[PDB]
Amino acid sequence: VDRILKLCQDIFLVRETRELELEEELYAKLIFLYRSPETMIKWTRERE
Amino acid sequence: DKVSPPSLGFLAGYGIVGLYVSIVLVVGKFVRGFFSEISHSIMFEELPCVDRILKLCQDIFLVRETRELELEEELYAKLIFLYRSPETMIKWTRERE
Amino acid sequence: LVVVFVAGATRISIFGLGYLLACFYLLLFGTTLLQKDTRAQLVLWDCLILYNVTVIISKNMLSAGIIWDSICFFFLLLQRRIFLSHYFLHVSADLKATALQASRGFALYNAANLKSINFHRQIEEKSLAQLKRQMKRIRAKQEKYRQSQASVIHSGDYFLFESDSEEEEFLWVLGQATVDGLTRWLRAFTKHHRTMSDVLCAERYLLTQELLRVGEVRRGVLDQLASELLLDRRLHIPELEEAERFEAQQGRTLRLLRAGYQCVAAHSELLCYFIIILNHMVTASAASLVLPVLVFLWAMLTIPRPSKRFWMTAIVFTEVMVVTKYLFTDSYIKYDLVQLMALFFHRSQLLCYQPLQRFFHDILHTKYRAATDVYALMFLADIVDIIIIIFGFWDDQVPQAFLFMLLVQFGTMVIDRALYLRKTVLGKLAFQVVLVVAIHIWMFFILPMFSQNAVAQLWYFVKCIYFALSAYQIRCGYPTRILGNFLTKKYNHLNLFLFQGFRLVPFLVELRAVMDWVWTDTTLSLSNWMCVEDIY
Amino acid sequence: ANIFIIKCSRETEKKYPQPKGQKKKKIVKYGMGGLIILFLIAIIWFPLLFMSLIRSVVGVVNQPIDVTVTLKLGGYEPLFTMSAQQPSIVPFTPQAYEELSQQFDPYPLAMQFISQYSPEDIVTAQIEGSSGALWRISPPSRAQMKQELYNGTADITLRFTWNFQRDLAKGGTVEYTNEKHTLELAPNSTARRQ
Amino acid sequence: FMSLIRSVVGVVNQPIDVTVTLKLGGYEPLFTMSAQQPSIVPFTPQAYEELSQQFDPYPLAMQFISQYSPEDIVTAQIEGSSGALWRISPPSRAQMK
């Protein structure tokens, strides 16, 4: 889940820095990621 | 010794707080029903543009009123297939310019 | 001194008043009394034993029950024998040494807190650089994606999802073990005062050994191994190594209680506040109500060190209170004397020293603090508070005031959370100064029989803890990264169990995410906030 | 109906487009968040109000409007009886509270018992020494009780029976409270000779 | 099952016992008597017409009389003479005298 958890920690960070448009464009990336199940498997692998 | 006017207490000191904690617990696991479980149904909940589904549903109502039944059950066929596959919702719910 | 006071206590005030004056004089000048000369020590001790053998025969002139007078008399003769003796002379030279070395220890404490302040300044600079790097990288990626986009929330596309890892990365051994772990924990708590005591003790020993004939230089001892450090690179006195080996030999519980005494000698102030609260907690209606308000006000607000003159006023007030309670008891006087003797213990162990409200109010806003934030302990103490109040329902007047108190408590908790989230400090100070006097005025109407009083006083004590932690937060003052999960910092299985616990208590997840969506600066909806914090 | 809700929430967007990244909804946050927090706090708290506001049934005092006392020696006939009412009953004054503080000094259980009740929970009934009637009894039964008290070589019981009755609109689901008390007299004893 | 528990209208309470006493002074109850349904007359509609008649110009009395059922008012009779004597201590008779 690391590539989602990084996105959410950055959503908290920009939420604390007040750069609002990257709040709502990381929220945009999150909503799109969850909405399409197929792009979750292309995005939640592991590395080696 | 003074006389209680109604003596309606109806229970002992121990074994009544149980009812209150049951009530709070049930209301709680009601109110976490839809305020902390809206994750699975995000896809259906949010669509940027719905016009190509809403036209399909208004036509389903129309053919439902004209009695041409086989286009009722083949627009219902198109609807069920559209909902079943999430991927074809993103290929179908864009906007135009 | 304590035995004399208790001899003055347990009997009727026919002549015992004089011994309160003794604890007025004796404890005030005790260090100086030891530091004067044998001639005047024996003069004043002879005066005191003369007044004792006066008052015994005076209590024979009424026309067994004098036991406290007899024991104190025995103690005075024993101390007089001590004070004659030529063995104590070098212990007196020890105390002469403790008169000299105070300013070096003051400068050492100054250097240690300067080291703390610049370690927290360096931590804050590193963390600000890290956060700036994060925002730089995020903005550069979002500019890249709008760049290859052009070649408002509901606009995402698959090309946002490139694999960009490019940028990121049998029982007695158990008993001995448990008591050795407990004394290791106490050593870990004591370590810094232990080191300070050790270095000062070594310096004192060296000075005293040198002080066989004369003593005239201070910087000449500062180089008998440069000005302002904390280093230890010097000689080795075999007497000190021998004492360290002797203490090292002990390994049983004696070391446990030794480290316990070193702990209660290190903090010293905490048990003063503890007993200042504990005297009010038991059988104190309105007498010790005017003292504790200003303990919070003066002590915990100005600077980390308690105010220069708060201690003197506190001790004089305690003595005045004990003397006033003589309109003519058993436990009351015993708790006021233990409070007094704790105050004088802390004053001796300290050994260092409308147009002015705005001055310290401004110094509260000069931003020299280490910026340590501990909200989770306020909120944990208030949750334990509400558990205690609600379980306290296990004549028929105190439940209505417990339940109005319950509602005010809920409101206060919500307001404190809101205050914590806008990063404001002055509002937290106003909330402090209102709530302390509100709860102390509420400490009238508990009683206009035993269980109710005990649970109400436990409630009072735990919100005294809450006020103390609130003043700690006023002192340290809101580090500029307060928005994170309180229980999430490291992914341990204990942490997972505690998080799944925290989402089990009713009405505590949705309240957190609603107060966060209302008071935090965000541009989403309420549902959007809920979705984000549940995905999280 | 869900696509209709979404389409309506899109069309109420299109008539009032919002600027990107800003307009952080200052008042509506306080509005909806205060509504939510007070709703949840009320759901938490009001259960102990309609839990508590049913327990305010402390009570009221029960001044006995009727006092009856009878001495019944033997089974032949009740010898003494009498009753009295609030005219011959004195509800206690705080002077009698100070008296009960005085009159029971060295007994701590009695001290706590006397200090337990209210001032107006103890009364003092008076009883006329003489009878209000005669000892109306069958002369056969009078002769039988006479011969029992003279020479009936067995024991004899006397029931002293106090009794009270309170009022009813004050509450209380029992009204005629009492208890007997027994004394035993020997065959040809001293009180038997009296 | 909200309503069919509320069908508890009531029934009439004809008093089977009537007792009346005149007690002058604390010395002795002078007059007493009781009676039962043999000496009680449950009212007849003739007494309903009488209560319609006997309380003409008082509207509160009119509504009070028209409130109850016919069979909710009775008329007890009492013997003028005593059923016993004034059995009393001659000391108490002298004191009341």
Short mmCIF file of N, CA and C in Angstrom, two decimals, chain C residues 208-272:
data_model
loop_
_atom_site.label_atom_id
_atom_site.label_comp_id
_atom_site.label_asym_id
_atom_site.label_seq_id
_atom_site.Cartn_x
_atom_site.Cartn_y
_atom_site.Cartn_z
N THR C 208 37.39 21.10 49.29
CA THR C 208 37.55 20.84 50.71
C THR C 208 38.91 20.22 51.01
N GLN C 209 39.36 19.28 50.18
CA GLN C 209 40.68 18.70 50.40
C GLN C 209 41.76 19.77 50.27
N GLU C 210 41.62 20.66 49.29
CA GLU C 210 42.53 21.79 49.19
C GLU C 210 42.38 22.71 50.39
N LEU C 211 41.16 22.85 50.91
CA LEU C 211 40.87 23.76 52.02
C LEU C 211 41.25 23.11 53.35
N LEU C 212 42.54 22.78 53.47
CA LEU C 212 43.08 22.37 54.76
C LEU C 212 43.58 23.57 55.55
N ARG C 213 44.14 24.56 54.86
CA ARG C 213 44.65 25.77 55.47
C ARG C 213 43.85 27.00 55.07
N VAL C 214 43.70 27.24 53.77
CA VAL C 214 43.10 28.47 53.26
C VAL C 214 42.31 28.15 52.00
N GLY C 215 41.39 29.05 51.64
CA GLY C 215 40.79 29.05 50.31
C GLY C 215 40.55 30.45 49.79
N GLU C 216 41.12 30.79 48.63
CA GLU C 216 41.02 32.15 48.12
C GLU C 216 40.71 32.28 46.63
N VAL C 217 40.81 31.22 45.83
CA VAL C 217 40.61 31.35 44.39
C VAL C 217 39.50 30.43 43.92
N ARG C 218 38.79 30.89 42.89
CA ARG C 218 37.71 30.15 42.24
C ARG C 218 38.09 29.70 40.84
N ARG C 219 38.60 30.62 40.01
CA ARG C 219 39.14 30.23 38.71
C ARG C 219 40.40 29.40 38.84
N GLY C 220 41.13 29.54 39.95
CA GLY C 220 42.26 28.66 40.20
C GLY C 220 41.85 27.23 40.46
N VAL C 221 40.62 27.02 40.91
CA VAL C 221 40.04 25.68 40.98
C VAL C 221 39.35 25.30 39.68
N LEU C 222 38.98 26.29 38.86
CA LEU C 222 38.38 26.02 37.55
C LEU C 222 39.38 25.44 36.56
N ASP C 223 40.67 25.40 36.91
CA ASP C 223 41.70 24.90 36.01
C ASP C 223 42.58 23.84 36.68
N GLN C 224 42.17 23.33 37.84
CA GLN C 224 42.90 22.25 38.51
C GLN C 224 42.44 20.88 38.02
N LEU C 225 42.40 20.73 36.70
CA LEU C 225 41.78 19.58 36.07
C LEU C 225 42.50 18.28 36.42
N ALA C 226 37.29 26.35 28.24
CA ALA C 226 37.51 26.01 29.65
C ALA C 226 36.46 26.68 30.53
N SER C 227 35.79 27.69 29.99
CA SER C 227 34.89 28.51 30.79
C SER C 227 33.51 27.86 30.94
N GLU C 228 32.78 27.72 29.83
CA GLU C 228 31.36 27.36 29.86
C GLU C 228 31.12 26.12 29.00
N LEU C 229 31.19 24.94 29.63
CA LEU C 229 30.97 23.68 28.93
C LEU C 229 30.21 22.74 29.86
N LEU C 230 30.10 21.48 29.46
CA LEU C 230 29.79 20.37 30.38
C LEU C 230 30.72 19.22 30.03
N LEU C 231 31.91 19.22 30.63
CA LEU C 231 32.91 18.20 30.35
C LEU C 231 33.44 17.62 31.65
N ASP C 232 34.09 16.46 31.52
CA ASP C 232 34.62 15.71 32.66
C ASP C 232 35.87 14.97 32.17
N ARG C 233 37.02 15.63 32.31
CA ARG C 233 38.28 15.15 31.74
C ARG C 233 39.42 15.37 32.72
N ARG C 234 39.21 15.03 33.98
CA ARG C 234 40.06 15.54 35.05
C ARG C 234 40.67 14.39 35.85
N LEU C 235 41.28 14.75 36.99
CA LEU C 235 41.90 13.80 37.90
C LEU C 235 40.92 12.81 38.52
N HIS C 236 41.43 11.91 39.35
CA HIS C 236 40.64 10.86 39.98
C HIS C 236 41.06 10.76 41.44
N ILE C 237 40.20 11.22 42.34
CA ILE C 237 40.49 11.13 43.78
C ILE C 237 40.17 9.72 44.26
N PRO C 238 41.11 9.04 44.92
CA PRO C 238 40.85 7.66 45.34
C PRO C 238 39.75 7.54 46.39
N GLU C 239 39.49 8.60 47.16
CA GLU C 239 38.40 8.54 48.13
C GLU C 239 37.05 8.48 47.42
N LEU C 240 36.90 9.22 46.33
CA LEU C 240 35.65 9.19 45.58
C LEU C 240 35.49 7.86 44.86
N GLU C 241 36.56 7.34 44.27
CA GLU C 241 36.49 6.01 43.66
C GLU C 241 36.15 4.94 44.69
N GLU C 242 36.66 5.10 45.92
CA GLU C 242 36.35 4.14 46.97
C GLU C 242 34.88 4.23 47.37
N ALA C 243 34.33 5.44 47.43
CA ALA C 243 32.91 5.60 47.74
C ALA C 243 32.06 5.03 46.62
N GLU C 244 32.50 5.20 45.37
CA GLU C 244 31.75 4.67 44.24
C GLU C 244 31.79 3.15 44.25
N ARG C 245 32.92 2.56 44.63
CA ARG C 245 32.99 1.11 44.74
C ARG C 245 32.10 0.60 45.87
N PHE C 246 32.07 1.32 47.00
CA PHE C 246 31.22 0.90 48.10
C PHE C 246 29.75 0.93 47.70
N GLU C 247 29.31 2.02 47.07
CA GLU C 247 27.92 2.04 46.63
C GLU C 247 27.67 1.00 45.54
N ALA C 248 28.68 0.74 44.71
CA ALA C 248 28.55 -0.26 43.66
C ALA C 248 28.32 -1.65 44.23
N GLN C 249 28.92 -1.94 45.39
CA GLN C 249 28.76 -3.26 45.99
C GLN C 249 27.30 -3.59 46.25
N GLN C 250 26.54 -2.62 46.75
CA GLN C 250 25.11 -2.84 46.97
C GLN C 250 24.40 -3.07 45.64
N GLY C 251 23.54 -4.09 45.60
CA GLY C 251 22.79 -4.40 44.40
C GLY C 251 21.34 -4.76 44.62
N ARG C 252 20.92 -4.84 45.88
CA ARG C 252 19.56 -5.23 46.22
C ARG C 252 18.67 -3.98 46.30
N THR C 253 17.50 -4.12 46.94
CA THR C 253 16.51 -3.04 46.97
C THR C 253 17.05 -1.75 47.58
N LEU C 254 18.10 -1.84 48.39
CA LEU C 254 18.65 -0.63 49.01
C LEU C 254 19.00 0.38 47.92
N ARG C 255 19.51 -0.10 46.78
CA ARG C 255 19.78 0.80 45.67
C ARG C 255 18.49 1.32 45.06
N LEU C 256 17.41 0.54 45.15
CA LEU C 256 16.13 0.99 44.61
C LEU C 256 15.62 2.19 45.40
N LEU C 257 15.56 2.07 46.72
CA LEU C 257 15.12 3.20 47.53
C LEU C 257 16.13 4.34 47.52
N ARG C 258 17.42 4.05 47.34
CA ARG C 258 18.40 5.12 47.17
C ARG C 258 18.11 5.94 45.92
N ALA C 259 17.82 5.26 44.80
CA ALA C 259 17.48 5.98 43.58
C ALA C 259 16.12 6.65 43.69
N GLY C 260 15.20 6.08 44.47
CA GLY C 260 13.93 6.76 44.72
C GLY C 260 14.12 8.06 45.47
N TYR C 261 14.98 8.05 46.48
CA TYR C 261 15.28 9.29 47.20
C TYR C 261 16.01 10.28 46.31
N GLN C 262 16.90 9.79 45.44
CA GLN C 262 17.56 10.70 44.51
C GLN C 262 16.58 11.28 43.50
N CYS C 263 15.54 10.52 43.15
CA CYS C 263 14.51 11.03 42.25
C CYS C 263 13.69 12.11 42.93
N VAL C 264 13.23 11.84 44.16
CA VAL C 264 12.39 12.82 44.84
C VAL C 264 13.20 14.01 45.33
N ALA C 265 14.53 13.89 45.36
CA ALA C 265 15.40 15.04 45.52
C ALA C 265 15.72 15.74 44.21
N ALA C 266 15.52 15.07 43.07
CA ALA C 266 15.83 15.71 41.80
C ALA C 266 14.69 16.60 41.32
N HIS C 267 13.49 16.04 41.16
CA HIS C 267 12.37 16.86 40.73
C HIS C 267 12.01 17.89 41.80
N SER C 268 11.77 17.42 43.02
CA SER C 268 11.55 18.23 44.21
C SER C 268 10.30 19.10 44.11
N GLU C 269 10.14 19.81 42.98
CA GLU C 269 9.00 20.70 42.84
C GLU C 269 7.70 19.92 42.67
N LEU C 270 7.75 18.79 41.95
CA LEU C 270 6.54 18.05 41.64
C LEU C 270 5.83 17.59 42.90
N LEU C 271 6.58 17.05 43.87
CA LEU C 271 5.94 16.62 45.10
C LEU C 271 5.48 17.80 45.94
N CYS C 272 6.10 18.96 45.79
CA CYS C 272 5.55 20.17 46.38
C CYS C 272 4.17 20.47 45.84
#
